[PDB]
Amino acid sequence: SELQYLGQIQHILRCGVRKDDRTGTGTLSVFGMQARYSLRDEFPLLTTKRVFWKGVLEELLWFIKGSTNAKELSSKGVKIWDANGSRDFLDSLGFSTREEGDLGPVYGFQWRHFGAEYRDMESDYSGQGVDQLQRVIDTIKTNPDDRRIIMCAWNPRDLPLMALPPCHALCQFYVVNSELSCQLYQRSGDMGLGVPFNIASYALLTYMIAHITGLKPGDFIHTLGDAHIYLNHIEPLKIQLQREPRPFPKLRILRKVEKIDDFKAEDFQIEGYNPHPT
């Protein structure tokens, strides 16, 4: 099913009109896309180009902890969020009083404390806001047929405080025949970098929730708003586009976990990941 991805990369490079991004760099853009990734006895960690798995793993565990401090992620060798929490950036946004690394009410905070009043990354928010993550887990356990199993990171109120608007605005879970599926609504997707990572990321979330709810991972539906390839990647991705997709690896969860919060980086083992070099 990695072909669907490549396909999406193909479709954008042959019907994708040009559209400049927030910065100034242009991109080839298509609006509204979807790809289905089976999670059955296999993990969708793209093989046509290596995905920064550690980053994926550590970032999610970071979202789950409810952390909004980029330093707590950087400490794990995953610096993908450091620039957005650096003294300069925070200042350029008007957050002069913010301790360095304080990203604001972002992903982690929304998932676990949606609606709560943000103070700073050091603050305790226990028992504050809606714990969407635990709610989806509990809903799955109690009413799997439920069609409102949603976790939304998009918080219009908190938007102005974020050291970045979330790309993963919303995700929905679905259960049938003891299979747990998840669909992500990605408002903006950098096909060349973020997307493969995001796919892996939510595939992981699903594996985790599945494992905790005693379900089997179903599918990960990936939906894109602005699916785009930055102009400077148009050829490199065309290079990748000709690479032969290899069998997806397998994600082994080593220990049984009672709660999403208990998962630790060492409980996860990617097996048989044979991605193309460079």
Add this chain to the structure above:
Amino acid sequence: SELQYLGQIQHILRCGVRKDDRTGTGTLSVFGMQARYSLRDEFPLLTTKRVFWKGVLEELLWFIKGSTNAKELSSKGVKIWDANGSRDFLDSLGFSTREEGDLGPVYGFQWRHFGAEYRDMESDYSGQGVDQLQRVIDTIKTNPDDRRIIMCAWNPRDLPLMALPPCHALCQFYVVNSELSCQLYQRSGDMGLGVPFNIASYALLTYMIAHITGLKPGDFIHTLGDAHIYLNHIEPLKIQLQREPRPFPKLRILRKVEKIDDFKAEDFQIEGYNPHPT
């Protein structure tokens, strides 16, 4: 085109799985679906089965007003929400102290006063909460390339207060070459009734915003979470699939409106809508 929709119908029939809902009515379900409807010189008002246009138009103008009073819509000849706002149904949700017609913080409220504290339908919320509607309208005019033009109805906090959890979690707008597109993330889709009406609803909103932002309607991307067919509709739908889809009608905005709040039902006229019998 309508074939997309019809194709989705056959897919749910040919590959959907049996899944039970809240009422336990039983359904053929597929999780994760996406259709693309061109809004260029045509309005996606389904022809293989009449769609309650007046309802679509009135409910939408009703959302825009920020109204959460079903009596407000019901007096427009649209009772689609009356049951949910009835003394009886409100009491089954625990809103026994809530004035009849009061659906709680639903779409209208979510779109114009997001994050504000809901009191009741009679309350003045002006200046309170985030006005997503105007915001997306503003962003389209000032920075159409914005990859964050989102309008979210899914308020994790407000959800319980609503007579009914939103099916239109959020929608995103996109702009390229003077064309305004819109993608709707529908968590639960009744392919036999709601969906066609939902599709129209947002097509109408897109047509409405393109007009105020001086853009052309491009595409309306319909994304579904739990796409389903109720088992008792399987026979009907089977017949509909036989039907020859007639050209989609056309929407004409008679008056030249400047602000999203000035749109009146009179300003809209559907043209050449030949919905199939019964």
